Amino acid sequence: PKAKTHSGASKRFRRTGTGKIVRQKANRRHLLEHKPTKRTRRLDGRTTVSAADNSRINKLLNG
Amino acid sequence: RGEVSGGGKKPYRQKGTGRARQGSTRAPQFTGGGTVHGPKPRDYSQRTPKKMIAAALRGALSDRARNDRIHAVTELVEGQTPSTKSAKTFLGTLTENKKVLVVIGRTDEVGAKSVRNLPGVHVISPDQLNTYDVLNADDVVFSVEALNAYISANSK
Amino acid sequence: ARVKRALNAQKKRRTVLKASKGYRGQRSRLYRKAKEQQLHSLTYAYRDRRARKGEFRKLWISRINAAARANDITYNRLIQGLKAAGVEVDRKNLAELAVSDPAAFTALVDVARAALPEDVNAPS
RNA sequence: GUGUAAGUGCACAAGGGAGCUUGACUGCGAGACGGACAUGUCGAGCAGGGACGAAAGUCGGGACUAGUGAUCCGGCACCUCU
RNA sequence: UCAACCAUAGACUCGGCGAAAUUGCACUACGAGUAAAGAUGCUCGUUACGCGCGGCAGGACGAAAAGACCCCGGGACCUUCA
RNA sequence: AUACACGGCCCGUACCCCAAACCAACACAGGUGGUCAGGUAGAGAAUACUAAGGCGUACGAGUGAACUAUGGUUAAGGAACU
RNA sequence: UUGUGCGCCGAUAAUGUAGCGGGGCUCAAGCACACCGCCGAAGCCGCGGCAGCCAACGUGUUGGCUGGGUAGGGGAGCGUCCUGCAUCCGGUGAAGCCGCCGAGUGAUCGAGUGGUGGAGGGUGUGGGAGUGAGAAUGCAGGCAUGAGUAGCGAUUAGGCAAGUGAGAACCUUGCCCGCCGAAAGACCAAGGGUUCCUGGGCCAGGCCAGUCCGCCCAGGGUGAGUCGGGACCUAAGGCGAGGCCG
RNA sequence: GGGGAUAAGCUCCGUGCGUCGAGAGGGAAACAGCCCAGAUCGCCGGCUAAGGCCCCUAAGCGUGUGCUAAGUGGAAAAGGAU
RNA sequence: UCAAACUCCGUGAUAGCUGGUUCUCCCCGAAAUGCAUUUAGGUGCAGCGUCGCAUGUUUCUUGCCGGAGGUAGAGCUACUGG
RNA sequence: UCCGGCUCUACCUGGCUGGAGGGCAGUGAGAAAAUGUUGUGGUUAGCGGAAAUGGCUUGGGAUGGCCUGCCGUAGACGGUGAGAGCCCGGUACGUGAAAACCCGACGUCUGUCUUGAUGGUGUUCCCGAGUAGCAGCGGGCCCGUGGAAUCUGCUGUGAAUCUGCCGGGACCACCCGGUAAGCCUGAAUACUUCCCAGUGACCGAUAGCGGAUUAGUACCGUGAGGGAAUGGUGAAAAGUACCCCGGGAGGGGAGUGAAAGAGUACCUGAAACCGUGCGCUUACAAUCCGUCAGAGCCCUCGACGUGUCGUGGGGUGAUGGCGUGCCUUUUGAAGAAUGAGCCUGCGAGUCAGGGACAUGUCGCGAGGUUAACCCGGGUGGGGUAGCCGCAGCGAAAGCGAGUCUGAAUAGGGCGUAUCCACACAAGAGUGUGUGGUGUAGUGGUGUGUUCUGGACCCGAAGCGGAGUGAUCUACCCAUGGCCAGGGUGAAG
RNA sequence: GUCAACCGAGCGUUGAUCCGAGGAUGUCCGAAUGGGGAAACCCGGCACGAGUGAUGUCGUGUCACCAGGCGCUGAAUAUAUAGGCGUCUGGGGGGAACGCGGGGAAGUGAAACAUCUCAGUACCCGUAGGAAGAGAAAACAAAAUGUGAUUCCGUGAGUAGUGG
């Protein structure tokens, strides 16, 4: 049979044009009462995945 | 191990016995026991594409043509009565090599029925024309109807 | 498809057990016991091939030294003398001389006597 | 003495005191540290709109490092998204 | 204390039938020592004619049982205001 | 009531049966329910000898070994053994 | 009185010298300082063969460096079976097996020959694998060491003559002897199933042998109005028309 | 360098320090980690390292000058002693 | 055989666990450390290995110049304490 | 279409009840039974069927080799004394069925519309009721109670008939589609106890079905239930007549036979293992059992000479030196840590799948390739539904070589194959606008890892479902039997 | 017939042995069905027939249960019913898989685990057929002027989504 995909890795990982892998960043949802805005501001956007986990993430996304 | 007869009872204790540990009387290391990684009923076909196939066939016919082994013929016989002696004499006229291919259509059954029984010959219809049957040969005898069909079927 | 294994084993069994005709007991009959001893055997042969050089050289030296000492010179000073004199003969052949022709060996002894330094324990 | 443990610093004061006052902002961020990874730390400089000051200029919390808890699932306000 | 003697079934000898568990090998000494820290097998010395029979039971970390005490992991069954 | 002539079905009957024939893996010192119950001594179906009756049962012949098992007697003392 | 170089006592554990590795050594074969030589390793060199990386050149030659290796990564190969295709040997003796003589750097090889034996095999190229065993307290069969050892199944105990027989401790008979005798005796039920009798037999079996046997083969043999059961009856309990529940 | 008794063949950290692991050969009496040295195969060739030259064991009962009298060499303390 | 029988089936149950895993040569060749961990005997990532491509000496070594450190040591009427 | 009678009734019409030509249909799902012809239509036995005693040699036997001929709508296969197109059996091919069975074909037989239809026109009536719907617990639908439609099960409640009702992912209004709660329906599809005919890069007696051999047998278990082992003489039994030893087994001669190194223990006939002879060696010696040197003796080949060394080779090998089994697992094992008695045979990274990623190779090339399926005696032709690429950014609308955020061209993020050449700005690390060079992916296959499956092999304790077991033992029920002999001396 | 020979006695061109289709016979147990029963073995009834001086015996048939139809009667009890008696037709059990409706786990995976998964699988039940079931729109769709019963295959798609 086919190779089934990983839900989480599909919902928390996408791919751009040139094959990069992309994620979002952490400590953004709650407890913002005391987090300064610069700390709240480098956590926005997306970020390219590390090197070390690229392979693992390929194997999760594809099959 | 899972299709053989029996074996579905632990034949004796785990301990106290002296002898080894065993869980079925049909495991591989026994004598009567299951094959482990055995043959299985499987398919062997593989999906070669149309373009590679036809490229093969054209190249093969070229290999024979350049060396002047493609002969043509209208027929192998006189009217509607098979006689293998006729076809054999005619192939003696036309050829001396051991093996040979014959391409006769469907309706011209007499040539097929005639030349069938010969030792070397291996007859074929050009609708199922292939490559093994070409390359195994030394000479190839087309009918003219066959050539025309082949060519006006491929060329369009 | 099924491939009985008989021939493909018999080959090496025949080899080994041909190569262990002379061994004494289960080392001369049985493959699982002669294989081991073949390991040890070839290994000990290797080691002895490297070391019979030193064995023979030891022998040659003992012969030379006893010959010389019966002509009243020590080995060490004999070889000092021949080194000084540029003489080229090796120890295998000095021993052969000692055995066969002691006269020639005594002549070589005399050469070394002549060519040694005067004051052997000098600070030079 | 430095709000609170200890260290590093502070008299050139970051210690003590008085007047205005809300930058205890919004939109970003070059280049860097540290770095298994996720986290974490500083950051000049640009724009609106301001404070203080005569101006230069400083202000994106506290002398610095601790003072808190990822993700999921729900909740409140606003949006010219469906 | 303090052990002695006697008879039967065995044990020993002869004729017959004739197994067993165990077994890496083998023409399988002792000492002081070295070493995975208790050596038939190594070192250095000492002793010993080859082959058997009856007998003892100090060792071969003897045979038996993939420890039953302990610890870890998994189960089981039992309890209780989990 | 008398006489005569007739019928009177099915199954098991051998053989072992406290056992070399059953249960016991063996021609196994084990287990198996029921029935008559000789004599002399004796309270007695105990126990000793025996009639009827039945077996000598399936490896033997030897031999003053140690030692082990079941038996036997023991000077003087009498639980000191433990 | 200082500092030194060797020294003394303190010193002292259990299988046997036993705190030089031993003999032995001060007529140092012991310590120190200088000196001379030498032995010594798979190190280096010397003569040869192979191999990997690079480089130079010419249609694969040479040269320099290199080459311990477990977990492990990569590369190149032998062998076995079945097959597509082409060719070769084979009852004028294939395979397989025992070999002898030889070969390859190795897995291995002999189209090199002898003996045995009796019908399929080899070669080159490709294809596909139930594709290589020395270990799993591994499975199946066969055979060893222990070993010609322990045992041979009770506490009743055997013997002499004669007998047939190829062959007698044991089988048949004779006379003795000894054992049980509320049993080791005679009769039934369950249970087993021909074990019973006769005739013949002893390559297997009997814990020895055996002319013997519950062993082997063939044949024969079990007779019921009244015996133990059924056709006569019912208890425990079972099955259970209809039936009720589900 | 810590803990320990500034004991452990103890335990825990550092170290472009080492070796063993995965590494043979020589020396250390025998001796994975010590010293030397890092094995392509052959040779009945030569020179050397560590170490050692009375015999066992191939090489020097080597040369020179002094000490040692204790079998020191070939275990050892506080301390004692013409 | 009973702290919950036996047989067939699910079932080839599952084990962070023990054992075992077969022909050859050539080249290179480790680690036993870090963070996390229902985790410490396992595993994930980083570390060290090789294969292929890319970048070409950027690595390493020695010399010279530039830079911060608060260790050994020493010192204390140069502070805190004895 | 004609009439017979009927519309209660005689009379004009409208509407029924009959028969008749006819048509339609039929064993249909649409009503159902049998009928008799009936097709070289099919199945259930079979049959014919071409061509060499060919020659020489080998051999026990020619079906072999070599040389001569032939047949062929038949050289598929097998057997026959060794590979047989021409010997046999049979094939290609054509034949063949009294009876039974199955297909249709018919005529019977049966119905069935025919008394009819096309359209008009304004309003009442009907359009499947304990149901659909709603609420409460629940099942299953991608959907685990969630905003959760549609489909549904049990209870409780409970409506209308066409401006009616149900759905179009809560719900409401509009439009759209459709007309529930009555019923039947072939063909495509799945499967093989049995039967018939064949194929195999499947096994070939420890394999293959457990079963080539009496096989679900023997044997085990009370019982359910487990569950084995054993193939081969040779061409044909011509199976050793006869004699000798022996009680017999068994054997030696004589024979058969091509061979008895084929004797009913029999094709070949390995190793372990068990012995007999011949040569060397071994009883003063401490041995992981070997290796290096090697005396001595014995065998052999060769050059020679009355026996003799050699570019020798082989078996034994006194004596000397060196030397601590194999594997697994361990920091570290010769290890007194595990495992192995020995031989022989058997026994563990496999397969599927347009699966995923990486990489070699081959075709095509800004294109590449088909799936199911259809036709094909075969491996071949077709089949455009699909998928991957060719433009991305953004949560999304949406925009587009740019886009997102933001008030912002003001910075940044992502993207615009890459390089190349000229410019302008800065050297806060280079950027921005031009020009050209022009982008490479895909489908087969091989290798490695990998996902789902028993997933390299063996191994539990123990979980669940359905059944077997109280003949042992625990207890109870129903019904019978057994307890020698001697003492004590309660109540009354 | 055969393992499987041996012996004996025979048949067959008047067509044997052998093969095929239909018939006949078809002991006893078995759904088992007269009653009973420890499966293959015990006892009977009724009609007829054979047989004995009569009985015994023997042979041929038939007798269970329910569901339905028909027929006779209509108990307590009045209507009348359940029930009872006779006759006629069905069903009853076996099967290798395949199907439809219903019930319905657990070890396993989650590195624990209960929700979840394994699986609505194994297994159990009731009924079938040569195939079954479903099946003629109270359906899809999206303003395209569309499709037109159902089922099974390929794709869509391991996607939209669902999910401690």
Side-chain angles (χ1 to χ4, degrees):
Chain A
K2 294 184 183 180
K4 280 184 176 179
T5 313
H6 198 265
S7 299
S10 172
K11 292 182 181 184
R12 279 96 141 227
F13 276 128
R14 289 195 244 125
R15 304 196 188 180
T16 68
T18 191
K20 301 288 178 68
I21 314 296
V22 169
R23 67 184 181 79
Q24 291 189 353
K25 289 185 276 190
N27 275 319
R28 188 66 187 272
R29 305 294 181 195
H30 66 95
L31 297 175
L32 300 172
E33 208 170 5
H34 72 278
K35 289 181 182 174
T37 298
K38 58 192 167 186
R39 183 177 174 182
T40 306
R41 181 171 67 238
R42 71 193 179 192
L43 300 168
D44 67 355
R46 274 81 64 197
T47 298
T48 303
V49 178
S50 66
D53 289 331
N54 185 7
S55 172
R56 185 177 287 277
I57 292 163
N58 283 108
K59 290 186 178 180
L60 294 174
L61 291 167
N62 299 124
Chain B
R1 181 181 172 183
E3 309 186 356
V4 301
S5 173
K9 182 258 174 62
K10 183 167 168 68
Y12 56 93
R13 301 178 189 173
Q14 189 68 27
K15 301 177 87 76
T17 57
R19 300 172 76 199
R21 307 175 299 180
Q22 297 298 331
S24 179
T25 65
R26 300 294 186 191
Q29 62 267 11
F30 291 14
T31 290
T35 295
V36 173
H37 295 305
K40 294 288 185 178
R42 54 183 284 181
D43 191 358
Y44 293 83
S45 70
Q46 60 189 2
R47 304 182 73 210
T48 303
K50 297 171 180 177
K51 286 182 184 168
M52 288 171 72
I53 291 159
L57 188 71
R58 280 98 163 101
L61 296 170
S62 298
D63 177 77
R64 292 293 191 277
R66 296 164 183 175
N67 292 305
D68 193 357
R69 300 288 187 83
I70 290 161
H71 299 283
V73 60
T74 184
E75 284 186 350
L76 298 166
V77 287
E78 189 59 24
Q80 303 175 0
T81 185
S83 67
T84 297
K85 186 177 174 183
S86 298
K88 188 179 178 184
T89 314
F90 180 62
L91 296 175
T93 290
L94 177 55
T95 296
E96 56 185 1
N97 307 123
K98 295 185 179 182
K99 296 165 72 175
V100 70
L101 180 63
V102 173
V103 175
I104 289 172
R106 302 289 182 83
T107 295
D108 190 359
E109 299 181 355
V110 296
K113 290 171 76 72
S114 177
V115 77
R116 178 183 287 171
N117 197 5
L118 293 173
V121 179
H122 184 266
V123 79
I124 270 174
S125 63
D127 291 331
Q128 308 299 315
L129 186 66
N130 53 8
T131 305
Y132 181 71
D133 300 330
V134 174
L135 291 172
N136 197 358
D138 306 336
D139 277 326
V140 178
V141 164
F142 280 100
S143 177
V144 174
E145 299 172 355
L147 282 161
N148 291 115
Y150 183 85
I151 295 163
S152 293
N154 289 317
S155 295
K156 293 187 181 182
Chain C
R2 185 168 179 275
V3 191
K4 287 187 180 179
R5 322 181 306 170
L7 298 167
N8 204 357
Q10 286 281 319
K11 289 184 172 181
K12 60 186 175 188
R13 291 175 189 169
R14 290 161 180 162
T15 290
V16 171
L17 288 158
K18 187 184 177 183
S20 66
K21 284 177 178 171
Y23 295 177
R24 195 177 191 283
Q26 284 185 359
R27 290 92 188 283
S28 175
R29 300 180 175 91
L30 306 184
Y31 175 69
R32 297 181 65 259
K33 269 57 177 288
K35 179 176 173 180
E36 302 175 0
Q37 204 81 49
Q38 282 290 108
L39 305 176
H40 295 288
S41 174
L42 301 170
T43 297
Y44 295 171
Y46 177 86
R47 177 257 281 157
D48 296 333
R49 285 200 294 262
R50 304 299 191 100
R52 60 182 166 187
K53 294 167 177 61
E55 288 172 354
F56 282 113
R57 185 173 165 86
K58 162 178 172 180
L59 182 64
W60 296 339
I61 293 156
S62 297
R63 294 188 175 176
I64 293 159
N65 189 359
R69 285 182 188 269
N71 289 313
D72 194 356
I73 189 172
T74 62
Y75 181 82
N76 51 5
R77 300 300 189 186
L78 176 61
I79 308 312
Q80 186 177 7
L82 301 182
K83 181 187 173 184
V87 182
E88 296 171 353
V89 181
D90 63 354
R91 287 175 177 86
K92 174 165 66 173
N93 292 319
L94 288 169
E96 191 73 26
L97 290 175
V99 174
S100 70
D101 188 2
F105 186 77
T106 300
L108 300 174
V109 171
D110 290 329
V111 170
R113 296 263 181 72
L116 282 163
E118 296 86 2
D119 299 329
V120 295
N121 292 315
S124 295

